[PDB]
């Protein structure tokens, strides 16, 4: 899976999150989140092709899948406990992430 198709998963995966009714969905949907996102943070983005991989900007984008990936653990123990309310209260905030990141690199 490409870049593209890995953000079509982590976005198409929010929605199941918070649209749902239920533990079972959310905590599955999270869990795809996460595999695209770690799928994601492999990848070089079009915006920074030309860079250096230690550049700030490459590291940026790396922080920035990091950032994301321990947010989606948060929500993820909060839905295997139950919490399905908090588990997508806490997948509406990591929107921040996906949005803060379009902003610079998209
Ligand atoms: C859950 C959070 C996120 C969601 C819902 C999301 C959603 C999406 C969607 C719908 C697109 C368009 C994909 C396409 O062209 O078909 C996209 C593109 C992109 N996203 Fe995200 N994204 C998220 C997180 C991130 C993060 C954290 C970053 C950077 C760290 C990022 C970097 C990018 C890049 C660089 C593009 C353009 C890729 C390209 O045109 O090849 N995204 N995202
Ligand atoms: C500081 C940082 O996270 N650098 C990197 C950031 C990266 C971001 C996306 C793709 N690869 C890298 C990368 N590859 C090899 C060595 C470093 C990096």
Redesign the pocket.
């Given at each position: 899976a490409?870049?593209?198709?890995?953000?079509?998963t982590?976005?198409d995966n929010?929605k199941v999150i918070e649209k749902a009714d239920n533990a079972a969905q959310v905590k599955d949907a999270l869990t795809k989140?996460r595999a695209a996102?770690l799928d994601?943070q492999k990848?070089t983005?079009?915006?920074?092709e030309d860079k250096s991989p230690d550049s700030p900007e490459m590291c940026?984008?790396?922080?920035?899948?990091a950032?994301?990936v321990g947010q989606?653990d948060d929500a993820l123990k909060l839905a295997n406990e139950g919490k399905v309310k908090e588990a997508q209260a806490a997948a509406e905030q990591?929107?921040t992430?996906?949005?803060?990141?379009?902003q610079?690199?998209?």
């Open positions: 490409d870049l593209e198709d890995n953000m079509e982590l976005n929010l989140m996102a994601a990848a983005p079009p915006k920074l940026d984008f790396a922080a920035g899948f950032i994301l989606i990591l929107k992430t996906c949005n803060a990141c379009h610079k690199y998209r």
